[PDB]
Symmetry: C2
Subunit: 259 residues, 2 copies
């Protein structure tokens, strides 16, 4: 069940994430910005090990030759101390739960991974990640908030985010595939990309906040290159909500707790 | 004022986490800490990407010496002094060696040659020239001593762009590469097929100690067309390598070794 892997949070890759987001590259020993840890702990497989969608070949939990579309659906993180640039870190991972649910387009499989990240023998971060497999497929409207950021995705941004995460999933860069093969209108803006943007905006609007908890859940896919915004609002001291959306409604919602 | 001769230095760590991603892209073994970085994998490193706001429309950094022309990796030459070590620090000293613009009947052609010298632990490890061409949008496969058959796909191309953190849209943005730059499909990277061509030479001659490699693109290789790499020995310590398919050669190169 449990698997422990290791990585260096090396500055060369941190530079590439920072450039992707248009942000500064922290120096050795400084805090890895929130959710940039997704660029690390990658153990990619050779092509023979890959599935048609570019991800690692679908394993035992799925039926043979599963045609369903895989999606990064949401997750939850608990923040204890920042991981630090230039240091090593271990990730202890486990499949927490697998579950069949009944979706709008048919039955969808829900996989929840749990990861614990340690540095210098201390737990820095705990995460749950929800992965969904669903069949080829009226959200809440964009509410008013205390901050907002307008964004305009393009394929270079999406390609770069896939690059720093070394995610082979073809829905983020292979336009003929994402349309003809899995039936989307165009490229999908990564769930974790917009989560990072929404959390980043909260932090900008709240620079003294010290993150304790972040939850995010996708509602509908965002398609490149349609403009969108990230927003949020304080609900109470140390409590905020965030969202990602546009004129067609919200694509992602999330919850922040902080000190 | 003179564009050539301005030296710039950059530093990196040849960290194994990115070596694993290169190894996976190529389906090769992942060298252990402290072993040799395989030939031409140095291209995954020394990346100083620019922020999204300083990117040109083709996904490369914006042109400072301006504009609408296609940029292409034309060729290069390398001299191998000693292998770079996985896990070590390394430095690259770079300069513009030569610049030429010709205003001919097919538009203006801008040719640029960069020089890179790579040092590790106070020793020169590798020297490189890289030829870049800017140009307005647009032989048979010989018999040899060795050959390898290859089928490109967009994941491969995406992965090679990822490890080189190369934003150029011709390697992954199918609507751009066709409509905007006039190719028939995704372009298989020159450096990628150069790595494949040299790697197949090293496979067929595992005792060969590389001294020099030269490569030149001849025509774009388009994904997903099957292609093959090969080459043959010309003389003691001399080989030629090539990349091509039924449609003709896409790249040639020369290997000197001992």
């Amino acid at each position: 069940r449990q698997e422990e892997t290791h990585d260096q949070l090396s500055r060369n890759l941190v530079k590439r994430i920072a450039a992707t987001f248009g942000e500064l590259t922290p120096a050795h020993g400084e805090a890895l910005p929130p959710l940039w840890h997704w660029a690390f702990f990658q153990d990619p497989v050779e092509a023979a090990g890959l599935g048609v969608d570019g991800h690692p070949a679908r394993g035992g939990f799925l039926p043979p030759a599963d045609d369903r579309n895989r999606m990064w659906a949401g997750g939850r993180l608990e923040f204890h101390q920042p991981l630090r640039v230039g240091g090593e870190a271990s990730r202890t991972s486990t499949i927490l739960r697998v579950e069949e649910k009944h979706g709008r387009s048919g039955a969808l499989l829900f996989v929840t991974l749990r990861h614990d990240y340690r540095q210098d023998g201390q737990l820095a971060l705990s995460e749950e990640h929800d992965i969904v497999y669903r069949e080829p497929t009226g959200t809440e409207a964009l509410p008013e908030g205390d901050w907002r950021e307008a964004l305009e995705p393009d394929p270079v941004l999406l390609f770069r985010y896939s690059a720093v995460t070394f995610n082979g999933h073809r829905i983020h860069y292979d336009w003929p595939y994402v349309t003809d093969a899995e039936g989307y209108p165009g490229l999908v803006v990564h769930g974790p990309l917009i989560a990072t943007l929404a959390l980043r905006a909260f932090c900008r609007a709240n620079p003294q906040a010290r993150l304790r908890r972040f939850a995010y859940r996708g509602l509908r896919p965002l398609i490149c290159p349609e403009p969108f915004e990230v927003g949020g609002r304080l609900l109470a001291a140390g409590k905020a909500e965030v969202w990602v959306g546009n004129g067609a409604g919200l694509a992602q919602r999330g919850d922040v707790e902080f000190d």
